[PDB]
Design a protein around this ligand. Structure first.
Ligand SMILES: CCC(C)(C)C(=O)C(=O)N1CCCC[C@H]1C(=O)N[C@H](CCc1ccc(OC)cc1)C(=O)NC[C@@H]1CC12CCN(c1nc(N[C@@H](CC(C)C)c3nc[nH]n3)nc(N3CCn4ncnc4C3)n1)CC2
Ligand SMILES: [Cl-]
Lengths: 235, 107
């Protein structure tokens, strides 16, 4: 590698990507709701209900930051979590949050990939193993992540706009080992949570061309007793 | 980080908890007093949940100190706000922000 854009660069996983990639002396841009002071450059997204407003603004700012330079990878690691079934009084607000944090971010990242990824470069998208099935207790989350899985399939297709030789791969974890999760779920089996450094080192391998899955892959990331395995799922 | 100054006191006993939703009206200004946004201009309060990384650190620490009905001035250093980069087009680089916040209720 040499240039990476981390979409979600201030989140738990995205902050670790910024740190690790800067430690390798890569140029790293963060796109998030606030800067990442560790990144080479930061782009700050507008809070708005207008998807086109937010998407046009980020696209313009990224285009000005990069100019004609292309990037080796876009790691779209944004996403949150908010729960609730279809009867919940919080359903509509939580769905709006989930669509903004997963659908909007993935879509903008995909467009940026067509415009700015080098030939042979990498786009990662943040899916969820749970959205391979019904998610009755987390309606918005499941819909958003299911949309991202489908988008990954589209990007692998002919004439999607992805550059020659580039790959879009979705990552489908269960739970990541993060400080916020350890304090939110202090009785869980952390040894079934995926270490952030496992994903950072996987991304580094994929960006550099080591053991890179085919475009359109849905890669399940499952940690069992501290050991993480990668398993393809098929849409 | 964040300085909290009381404009008018709250009930002095209902303070937010993690998991509760704070309902507020605010006006945000630059250090020179130039207004950049107000929820009052929309006649609609801003809502956020503490403990969920939903807001700049100065609000996360500042609003947690307020009781229901309090009106407070939060003066927030850049490292507790938008930092060196700022938010181009609305918040300048390394900006100290001042927010007038009224904690209307907890939901
Ligand atoms: C209207 C604003 C103006 C300027 C006029 C204003 O007056 C002003 O200043 N304020 C308004 C009044 C209050 C004071 C202040 C303020 O705080 N405003 C916030 C601005 C957002 C913010 C800023 C610093 C933060 O520090 C913790 C947290 C949040 C607001 O409106 N919050 C409520 C609106 C509903 C959300 C957006 C969705 N949601 C959320 N949370 C995270 N967490 C991140 C990680 C986290 C640690 C950064 C994540 N997790 C996976 N990756 N990154 N990320 C995202 N992204 C989606 C977009 N996107 N694109 C790329 N990456 C991403 C990740 N969205 C929760 C909050
Ligand atoms: Cl579920």
């Amino acid at each position: 590698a040499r240039r990476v854009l981390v979409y979600g660069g201030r989140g738990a996983l995205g902050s670790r990507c910024v740190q690790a990639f800067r430690a390798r002396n890569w140029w790293v841009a963060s796109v998030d709701v606030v800067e990442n002071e560790e990144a080479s450059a930061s782009i700050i997204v507008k809070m708005t209900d207008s998807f086109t407003e937010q998407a046009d603004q980020v696209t313009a700012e990224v285009g000005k930051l990069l100019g004609e330079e292309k990037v080796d990878a876009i790691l779209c690691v944004a996403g949150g979590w908010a729960g609730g079934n279809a009867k919940s009084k919080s359903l509509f607000k939580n769905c709006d949050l989930m669509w903004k944090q997963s659908i909007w971010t993935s879509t903008i990242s995909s467009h940026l990939a067509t415009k700015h990824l080098k030939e042979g470069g990498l786009l990662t998208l943040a899916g969820a193993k749970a959205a391979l099935d019904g998610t009755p207790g987390m309606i918005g989350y499941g819909m958003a992540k299911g949309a991202v899985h489908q988008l990954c399939q589209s990007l692998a297709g002919k004439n999607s706009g992805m550059p020659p030789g580039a790959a879009a791969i979705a990552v489908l974890p269960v739970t990541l080992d993060t400080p916020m999760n350890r304090k939110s779920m202090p009785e869980a089996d952390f040894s079934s949570w995926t270490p952030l450094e496992f994903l950072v080192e996987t991304f580094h391998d994929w960006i550099t061309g080591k053991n890179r899955p085919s475009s359109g892959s849905l890669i399940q990331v499952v940690t069992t007793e501290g050991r993480t395995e990668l398993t393809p799922a098929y849409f | 980080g964040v300085q909290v100054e009381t404009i008018s006191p709250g009930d002095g006993r209902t303070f937010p908890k993690r998991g509760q939703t704070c309902v507020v009206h605010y006006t945000g200004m630059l250090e020179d007093g130039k207004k950049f946004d107000s929820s009052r201009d929309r006649n609609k309060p801003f809502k956020f949940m503490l403990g969920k990384q939903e807001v700049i650190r100065g609000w996360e620490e500042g609003v947690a100190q307020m009781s229901v009905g309090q009106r407070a001035k939060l003066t927030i250093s850049p490292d507790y706000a938008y930092g060196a980069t700022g938010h181009p087009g609305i918040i300048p680089p390394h900006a100290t922000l001042v927010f007038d916040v009224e904690l209307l209720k907890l939901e």
